[model samples]
Target chain A: SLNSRVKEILKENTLRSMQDSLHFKVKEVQGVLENTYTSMGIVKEMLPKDTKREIKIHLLKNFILANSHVAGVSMFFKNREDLRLTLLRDNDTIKLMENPSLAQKAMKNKEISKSLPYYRKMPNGAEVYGVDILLPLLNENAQEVVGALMVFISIDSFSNEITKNRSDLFLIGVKGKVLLSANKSLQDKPIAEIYKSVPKATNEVLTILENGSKATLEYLDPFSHKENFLAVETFKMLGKAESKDNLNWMIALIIEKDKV
Target chain B: SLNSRVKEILKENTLRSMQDSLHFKVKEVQGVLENTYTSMGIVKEMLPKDTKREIKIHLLKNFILANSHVAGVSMFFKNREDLRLTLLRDNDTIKLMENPLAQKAMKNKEISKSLPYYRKMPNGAEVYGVDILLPLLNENAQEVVGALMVFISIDSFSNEITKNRSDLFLIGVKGKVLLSANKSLQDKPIAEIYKSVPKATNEVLTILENGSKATLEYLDPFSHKENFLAVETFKMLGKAESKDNLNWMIALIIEK
Candidate 1:
């Protein structure tokens, strides 16, 4: 009934508008992502072969609720040239196998990872969007980065991390470009472009980037000609930060003034 | 379709069997209940009149997932002695409104209370459950409007609270057994083991209400085992400190 209800309302192109009404809290969203990412670190070392598959399924179930398009996990071994195992999903359906290009591309990265979890065409000719989270299979005895375990989850799911009732969420790059967003038109665009005429709000974006962990500001909606509220929360990894951990992003939720 | 699907699973009777699978942390449940009670307090004080009704509806939708038998919210105002606004759903049908004891309690300004009774539905259906009633108060004032109630199937609690290792029960004030996670013990008394159940039950209620630490033991009659027992009493109302409140008692029988 919920599915059918959504279908009826979805036909009028109201899903996005309805989705915009959902509100999200920064801390709650941050927790789910960090917990899952941390859990993957444990899953890599703890699970047996073929046993790791269920972990993907379990996380996918939750990640989808967080608004994910797909969630998957792939494991690599120290000696093996190819990935030892991979479990994938695009929404609810699990895939048997697909082109290994995403994993192969991630495996080749030895430095900082992808610009953003990018969207690429699948072997079956559908486009999937997500990031390839590559966690180095660590070796305590040898003090070396062993083979890597990469978790690929759609960036859209990242947006779902926050509540969706009140505002449009954007995962912002260090330079103010939108990295991940529910508002697809704004994806890859600079935050200022949404309200080009609001020079004050545009400048405040960088000031927010340079300043505190939590800040809220009011701005003019450049297009709507109305007041807007922006709540900015700088992203940080929840656990003890490792030297190689490069989680540099900001979450900005734009609120319409009257709605607040 | 929904009713039929429920009826088949209804045949095998897994409600009791599956109840043993549920495990809830006491502290967590207490925290959630307190927070929600606090929220309703703020909402009643701050939100508009019509707005107050929606809050109860939203909460009912989620509490149902915790395996409630019937979840609903109804508004009681003077012009309408009966509930003028209502939303209801049991395991079966999704509509109905007719309960006087709860209405009488709300009218008397009882902020929170529970009544274990046999409910006679309009269509002659019988419901044996605990009616958890919470009063709706007007904004910025203490005046009562109506009530929000949830009827938890006594059987529903037997399953949800125990989570496999224990048999749980809700024993009301008058030696009336509300529910037993092991259903066969329903409507039974605690007399066979305790020299005097009424006195023992009263003592347990006092400690829970007194804000003091308490632990009591009882030889479970049916299990015939020395099971560790813990009892906690709660009053749900407009505020944590409201004098006008309704009270209920809960017991957990941990298998030793």
Candidate 2:
């Protein structure tokens, strides 16, 4: 019986609660992912009725404010010779990034044409993620993307909201590598390290990411050498990016075996 | 391909987002369910090393405060001498409810049980509901304290879990339709409607209890609609109960 097995494995009520926390943690992370995608709708709604092709800085910032859990909002006009971008945070217009290339790549990349948010380390070594919302600043009749709206959300704040003041299982990743995790040390490390010498860990992860859906599995933890549960769920970029080519990122909830 | 089919079924961009809302709603509800179950843990934590039948109002109140989203918290003394119940909302302590019969039924019986109960709205339509019974005990006393039951309003559930606003259902043993996306199917017995539904139900129950995701095809017990369903089971944590007896299964069904 699972009860007896769990009793034999961890032999403590605290362990079960810890494991239970993992399941809820997975739920929380998904909730955050869903809301983040929702936050992008605010930026998309910023599309003005006129062909003015200018960022409505204040209105866009207000919309982001109403969209809970969003860290900051940035609107970019690549058509301008200056590549003028509005960085709005904490009710104030902020300065541009030391690494303007981050937004630059987001605004003008054929490789990552989709608007899904991706993680990048800022010049000052601060880790944050931004979703590039390509709003069409167009020829009123001939709709085309002449500008982009980049919304930067605090990865730290998102991580905090999902964790909810607990040492819960938190994982954020892409195809092959773990981009973020509850344990910051594991950031940028291969997600494979989370699992034991279990056969087909990468294959298992790949299969999950390839599906563009969600799944849950049990595996042995490398450090604990006991079975653990992992749930993998994915989301489109900013809840607006229909382009599914490769912009999807995976959200995994890892629960330790002993705890379970 | 399934992808193309999804694109076709949801023709409009907003429709897809609307459907996506359903998934998030499921996740949100599951989050609610997990937290409610977690609320019970606080009472269990109250069991002292010594025999104390008295209530720890402060500690219990803190538990409710932190577990946010729960309607209220109730405490029971097996004697029913002190059926102290606490109703909390908007950061205020409210009134209470009926006797702990739901929890009483759970003691030494099943880990937990859920059933559909409803009330007539002003418009005369029945608004359905669910009661999640969680039993509490005094470890030191080695006897049942009173039971803690969490009342969940089925109406409170956002209609978002239904991916397409069709085919999703919540069923019980004996084929009782506790909740369904389709209005006409309300309170109908699924086992009575389809001979094969019980078998399909068993398969889904078994796989979910084993802690695995599953997909099964079953005729819609109401409309006789052919549907494929993805099932996720929620097992109420129990002392004597394990995987074999699940409290509920959230079946996301899609008509073919």
Candidate 3:
């Protein structure tokens, strides 16, 4: 079984390399998101207690212009339904309007929240997938939440990075929904459907995905009918925070045994 | 022979793990510095031509207040010797003064530069830190208009990477120890600090100044045992016109 031993070594090295790559990408994403969040904090602090609407819109436009990834920004102030504002960046001009649906969804959550991918139409009439990040705006002391701020970011490049790898990569949400996958058709589908042939292994994989557990398991693929290794790495989106709604995501990498 | 093979595998694994950890830390440092650089660019764009001195000082103060790692900011205008301004954060107040020497030194370089560690006195205390200088460009972005200098606290960054690990050392280009967990080695020449292993010291310094990442085994001066030394060089991001290659090196030594 000397050949078997060699295969085992190869598999271990491949899994380690995959883990390192995923970790680095996750760190990069965290850096971008956290930096945006901090910039929002600074803007929040600079706002006057009774700032004019024109001044507020000007402040919000800076965020979209300064960050290429950010497409739009919406703010909902407390006790002022008429003051809701949304700014969408066009080629060089910015469109200001009231988006009640976005503000309504943002007000439903008191904690920081990240939404699933949704289609957003650009000012030039092109539709793209964007994710909405909602954060509660705090008062001067940061002890009480005054309102909420929502930022819409384009994730096209982020998705391309994960799918560019040779191995099958999947980014699954906490509820086992496939947030992203190398296979375009599998996006937003239940991951269990991939392992329908093996009912027992399907349940096991679903449990791990939902729990965000770090694990390596061997299972037979329904399509290839061969033994495959699945490695899972779990991470939180916002780094270290004591929020109750902090989202957990898993990067799952799959490779065939013989491929090693 | 089998024992030798096992030791080889162990060393390889250890080196790989160390490299991963170092890579993560370096990325974190890059994130902070690059974010600051981008913020400075935004501030530069907001400045209007012929702005008042009071408005300029107010804008500079915002950076120090927003970033906890920044302690002070100094600005030098082009062809305006009397327009130099420096603001230092002391408690809740800011001290504004004319720092001609700092402006003079800044005008000597056209590209970005990071200073070596130097002793800085706070309002009522003392600390060691470094300064990062970036050239401010005119509206057309054709010529340099002035320079912006930011003083970053060493302890603010060093404490994050060096906590509970005595093996890490941050060395400047001249082989001076900018930061280390061991307090006694601060500002000491690396070659003179590890005099017991003169050959290893020279080799590591050469690798660091040459801007290379390498892993080598050397004899420890204190324990007189073989140890692994991994070096990673860090260079600050700058504008495309910058030709100066300013860098710092991070080295980790572990017992074999």
Candidate 4:
């Protein structure tokens, strides 16, 4: 939940009632992905070898309206909050969502993104991670795949609070490659910084190469990327030196026009 | 498509200049699933699975809405002429929608009453066939499982030239359904048919289900549930012999 007052604002202002099943629908759709083995069994019985090798690619878009700023903050101690945002494949020119680092992460992952993992830094400054299960129903050329429920998850950093709010986003092919990640897209203008000596990390963590789900350890350079908040220690340092209300320090995290 | 003239009517309507995505969003909240899953998934690793799931469910509702109607048409097909009929969901008696056939179908399946598939062949001829999709999501346990989505697609068949409008009404779970259904309601006492429907349908269903019934009440948004929106459709048909070009119709959604 965003905030009680913010919740009130949403209650007062939404186009529809809150009695439908959009939430369950997502899980159901995901479940459909999970039940692919049986789906492949049916397809295999129908067609032997390759008639057309049609990877039945179907993408459906369901639209809605959000209540407010459509963003939230939480202390992840495994905390998770829902942010409602979507795009209109309605036309070309993918309207980039304006969530600073999050937007950049989506760009790195092509045009699709998911929120499944927790993103936080641990006591030893290790990057906590999260996973996005990318089950590709449609191939790159919009064809149907048989018996392939390949998933891509995002993994980054290690911390209780960070890990809860986020997961790992991956781009899994028949071959194991990490693809791109969609977590903590902080201003890490350099790729080298992300790959430099991460503690106990391996290629599996960087790119999804195995079956089922797995977790790997990593240590992220905070300076390499952007996060919603930074420098509580720095904020304290400033406040301790000068006893003024440095609310601007928190507001600094916001991608305001002045910063832009 | 509700009406051939409706396509032109939509062209005459206000949202003409906006882009397609804008139209889709406006129509999803304004016409389809109300505006339940208005959230988008921009960040993969940094968002909540529940929030993403809720948003996806709303999209499913919109997809279902864009496809259902009296004639059982695609949701993207809107009848501007149907809007001419002005269907209102009276906020008080919103519960009639839960069981449009009044509980013949619980949660997912729909069964039509013993009448006309079409009025001309009301009893014997299969003038109409009913296709019902129950709520994938259930509501309260004590009450009927709350329907996240329920649609009754009614296709029409008739001989008269006036009997040409094959339409369907996609109703919210419990607020309103019926974009122009029921001939008896037209010339006869309107309230009588309204009372008659739930009366016969519910009674018969309770007898069948062993006295189980969904709890009926006024609709509430942001209170009872979060992330689901309700929309209503009300349509009425005129006499097959009537000279007026108008066919009575109505549609609306009660957003709280």
Candidate 5:
């Protein structure tokens, strides 16, 4: 898989140029990041492995395209996976995001998901995984998000399996509205109950989504559905999500780590 | 009073910055815009001849610092005064905002003031008249915004006047909730049946109460209830909204 670990190693070289170049001996930054994320998504699809997929995000919510409607960009990764991330924006991504369940609910009035776009994929406690989408919709006073500097819309499927692993971390993605379990590699297990306090880290994501830059954290436990757990988990999310797009959701999550 | 014309001018600057700022400049931009807004709010309270004061927004259906709690900024016209604006750096030449109220409403709402954000704002027709915040909340999905960016804990009030203009538009920030005009404003004037949806309430009163979601179109010319001013009025509100201290309950999450 296109591992970020390899890219980090390649990033050791510093180019004198202020701007980053992927093909340059400088270690393709965008290409590597794109590859890492794409590979991670592929890993989930191919092997459904329990691996550590570290990725640096270029954009998340306010993804703008030169074409106003959609944005297309491709980048390469160093890993042997031969993976290249081709981000499809606008209608393209929307088309890829055709979940019959959500649409059916909307049609039947069975608690249809409003334009609150989100998706998830996860496993047990220690290793949870997922992705989210902060889109421009009329969900909550959603104004028009004109072409922002950049936006990050990624497929959060870890289609790889490092080893047969079992854990308790629950992962969910806002874009795919997906939830997965890493405990079983053979069985295509989808977590039934969405977390009571899901869409955490939305605030951090919005920081990035609204403008195009910022930082924060996110925390999660397999099934800590307690009042105190919510606060504690929130704190952890804030702390761990120091990196941009750390939690990957336009869903703002504010929790108290220090239990009073 | 901080006339709607000036508010629009100031808000446009805020909107452009919001469309570009990478979140670093968001706070400064938000302060600049809010500073202009509150300043106008202060001046608006002092104006007597201003007459029908107004703001435009929906109820809970819209996002506000108070509702859905996303820490984005908002802009809206406070006073709808007709403007005979004199261009800066030029003398004698003036630009008149023919129907300042209608114009402000159209520009801020980004849609026909009669319609809500549920419908898209016409393309490129953004930046309401008073939203002074832009820099603080703009960001791509990769960067993380600050706490204030997603803690929508306040409600919004939209005051409308029935003087002389009409069009469909909506002024939406990254999210219209930032503007918080979720309905409650009626040109029919609020005596007892209607309350006041004042600006920022800490400054003025709003017709919005207890954070209720409501839709206030023209009452309709036909008879819907004894209140109808035209063929289409009394549209059902998308949500509830109000402005007391009920300003601490908005929240939202980002996509990763």
Candidate 6:
């Protein structure tokens, strides 16, 4: 009985440490997003009323080069007929292209919007998973939205930091889908599907998604059939101008009972 | 007269544009420094009371690796006799060394910045850089445990500000040039650099003394031509209330 109690305490300590690390990682991500948002606003202010498209593209390229976190930048005009341009960083050079679908999606949003994690292929043929943030660019009067500036943020580094030595961690999207995980096969898959065999674990995850709060629970591993502890922390990935309902993400950590 | 008036207006517009660019660059630098400060605080919080030196070194290395802007990280203990460890990023690897002078200077401040200095890398490359130091607190966050030093590459920090424009300069509070497009003027006092034009030097000195943002037409000391100079001042974002908060000046000169 004493041995079990000792093990429980150690497990609790480990969970708290993991939760703190998750909080730190979330804060880091939010900091990067907020800083970029502020910098983008500055760039928006510097844009002249009748600036040439070439100059605007130059500014966007400079913005991407200055910020290390941004992988790509896109500007979408309100007029559908106008050509939309996306500048992607390819090692030393930047490539310009048109992505009508992303522009269409961005134009529909009145405020800042974040896209679901998706695979982006680089010029070198390397596919990296990241999210795109679209911020509504306002006119001089700030009364009307002129266009949207979208930035693609690579999450490969964030994912690596989270699951550095541990593979049981997962970053879940608002829709209960896994946004990032050490297990590449689990990415974008619904958490419920992964834990479907264990009804209790599935229920707990659902509760976490609904409540959007910190939680801890015990679950039986489906494959290993071992007792495990699951810790979940929810965070909103948002820019300074965005509301609380922007994008909710969760950090989930699982550890086997025997590991402690 | 009409041609002169049009030229004046154009110069004014150019000055405003340069000022805005300077402001944007300042904001970018502040964001990097502030984010690093916040991250360092997190690392401090994560440090245990009785953590081993090796473990602390490992944490510092991770911090430097995660932040792209940070060139090096160092921790100085309150007890002077304790060996200080500075971890420098050398391409793919991190080097650990002792810098007694930096530790001594960092001991007396809550937040401080060092003058731009030249650093020789392990690969025999020399790079100009600056250091931002913050006081480290104990686990309870009650008392001062030591100080944390962060090294930032000046080229990366001020690349946008001084890259293309030869007339632009980033000056320290005391008028020393921290960054400049002209390599010969780096680390030199602005007044000394512009001493040939006494009138221009006086005006710039007075503005620097007032610590105010202004735009004025002055004779360019180097080119012996009339130019419009835009001067803007910036300080650390969160340390405005403190007396020791240093205000740096950004000067942009445009041909009139």
DockQ per candidate, 2 decimals: 0.02, 0.03, 0.28, 0.05, 0.01, 0.02
lDDT of 4 by residue, B158-180 (tens): 22101443222222212223223
In candidate 1, what are the lDDT values of residues A1-260, reduced to their tens digit?
Answer: 97797566643333232222221244444445544543443344432222234443333233323323336666566665444555566445655452342334434444324335467555456666666666555454424545666667566666555335523667776567776665567766777776677777767776766563555667877656787777676655323334243554677776676663
**Model no. 2, DockQ:** 0.03
Candidate 4 chain A has its poorest 10 consecutive residues by lDDT at A56-65
Predicted candidate 3 versus true structure: per-residue lDDT over A103-168, tens digit per residue? 444445556676777778878786656678777766657566667777887654456546765547
Candidate 3 residue pairs that clash: none
Winner by DockQ: 3
- Superposed by TM-score, candidate 4 places the C-alpha of residue B100 at a distance from the truth, in angstroms, of 26
For each candidate, the alpha-carbon lDDT, in order, equals: 0.50, 0.51, 0.69, 0.24, 0.24, 0.68
Model 5 segments more than 4 A misplaced: A1-125, A129-260, B1-130, B134-209, B212-256
Number of the candidate with higher lDDT, 3 or 4: 3
- Which candidate, 5 or 6, would have the higher TM-score against the true structure? 6
- Which stretches in model 4 have alpha-carbon errors above 4 Å? A1-51, A54-131, A136-260, B1-191, B194-256
Q: Which segments of candidate 1 are over 4 A away from where they belong? A: A1-24, A47-70, A82-85, A98-115, A122-125, A139-142, A159-167, A180-182, A210-212, A237-240, A243-245, A258-260, B1-256
lDDT by residue (A82-174, candidate 5, tens digit) is 223334443333211211112222223312122232332211212223222111111122232211111232322332211124232222333
TM-score of each predicted structure versus truth: 0.41, 0.43, 0.79, 0.20, 0.20, 0.49
- lDDT of candidate 5? 0.24
The deviation in Å at residue A224 for candidate 1 is: 1.5
Q: Write candidate 6's Cα lDDT for B1-256 as tens digits.
A: 8779868876665776667655655555666766655555545443323455655665576667656667777777767534377777687556565644445444553566676788876677766777766666664656777777778776665555665557677777578887888778877887788777777667777777777777777777778888877887777435534344667777877787
DockQ of 3: 0.28
Cα lDDT tens digits, model 6, A1-260, are: 96798677756767776675566555556656655665555445433234556656656766676566678887877764343788887876888888773444555555667777889988768877888887776665766777778888877656655677878778788668887888888877887898888877878777777777888788888767998888887777664466423756777878797777
- Candidate 3 residues B1-256, lDDT tens each? 8779878887798998888777777777777766666566555543323455655665677667766667777787878776577777677546565544335434653435555555455566656677766666665765667777777776666655587778888787678887888878888888888888787788878877687787888887677888888888887553334544566777877898
Q: Please, what are the lDDT tens digits per residue for candidate 2 over residues A1-260?
A: 96697556544433443334444545565555454444343334333223232325433544454444454555555555344445544333343432342444544442223343466454345546544444333333534455555555555555665555643344555554555556676655666655437657657876767676666666777666667766666655334345333355666666675554
